[PDB]
Amino acid sequence: NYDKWEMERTDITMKHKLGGEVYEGVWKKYSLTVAVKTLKEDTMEVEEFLKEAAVMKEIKHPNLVQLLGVCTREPPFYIITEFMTYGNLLDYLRECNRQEVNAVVLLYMATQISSAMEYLEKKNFIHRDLAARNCLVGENHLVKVADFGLSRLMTGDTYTAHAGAKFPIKWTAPESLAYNKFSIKSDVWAFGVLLWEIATYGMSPYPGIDLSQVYELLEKDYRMERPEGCPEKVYELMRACWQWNPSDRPSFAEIHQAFETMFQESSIS
Numbered sequence: 001n002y003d004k005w006e007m008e009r010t011d012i013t014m015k016h017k018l019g020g021e022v023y024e025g026v027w028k029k030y031s032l033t034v035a036v037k038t039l040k041e042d043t044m045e046v047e048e049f050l051k052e053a054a055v056m057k058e059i060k061h062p063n064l065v066q067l068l069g070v071c072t073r074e075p076p077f078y079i080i081t082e083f084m085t086y087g088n089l090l091d092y093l094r095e096c097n098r099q100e101v102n103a104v105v106l107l108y109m110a111t112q113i114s115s116a117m118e119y120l121e122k123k124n125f126i127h128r129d130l131a132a133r134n135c136l137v138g139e140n141h142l143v144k145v146a147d148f149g150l151s152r153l154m155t156g157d158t159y160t161a162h163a164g165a166k167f168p169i170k171w172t173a174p175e176s177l178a179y180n181k182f183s184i185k186s187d188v189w190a191f192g193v194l195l196w197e198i199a200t201y202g203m204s205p206y207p208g209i210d211l212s213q214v215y216e217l218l219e220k221d222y223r224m225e226r227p228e229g230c231p232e233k234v235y236e237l238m239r240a241c242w243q244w245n246p247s248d249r250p251s252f253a254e255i256h257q258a259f260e261t262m263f264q265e266s267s268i269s
């Protein structure tokens, strides 16, 4: 009945809708621009809305979108987070000045994301839809993973998604496609694809390839080619993420350490 995260809905003024349902609003007390997720008072997604709120309370990491407060006493239910200025990483990359957002910057963004994912790995969470679209950007190439796609692993290492669930085939690991099973390893695969998105400045993965065939191509060892101007080390990491066997994919700890060193090395140059 008492929750520290619960804030008065009074202290929030809405400014502008951003999608969906998400708004740019203002926490008036702190004169702070915030992001506010909400829902229609006629929805069955109330339970999962609240579950994700609860999850986000447990989450604390620089490269994970920070929860600020909630309004879960009566409709409309709010989840308030910090406001990421530039929106998602996909559109950012597509619209960016590539002279500004160059190689070392891409390395930096990958490093940040892998930090967030290592954190989740440690905390027994998995992200159900890890992609550039669900990474948000702030000033100085700050990247944060959107935490609404998070699921906690209560037992074991494998989250089974609800029966008949749609999933982004090109981002989805083959064991997830075949069995609806998501491990942190599945997220490692997805992160590989995200690396591809970053390197290509937001190209659609497996471009031109009919979705129906995708799985079958992966089974027969087809992987996306190294993007133009992508360092061979990075591509090697991408292929490592796309190992057929989940057990052969690296951990996000390994991945993050790799990108950390690579980034420092590029920073020297």
Ligand SMILES: Cc1nc(Nc2ncc(C(=O)Nc3c(C)cccc3Cl)s2)cc(N2CCN(CCO)CC2)n1
Pocket: 018, 019, 022, 035, 036, 037, 065, 079, 080, 081, 082, 083, 084, 085, 086, 087, 088, 136, 145, 146, 147, 148
């Ligand atoms: C859709 C959108 N989001 C933006 N920023 C966001 N920051 C934080 C957000 C958020 O969703 N947090 C969150 C999470 C992660 C989980 C549960 C609950 C919540 Cl509340 S959404 C900015 C933006 N644009 C501004 C930049 N554009 C050019 C025009 O200047 C157009 C697009 N568009």
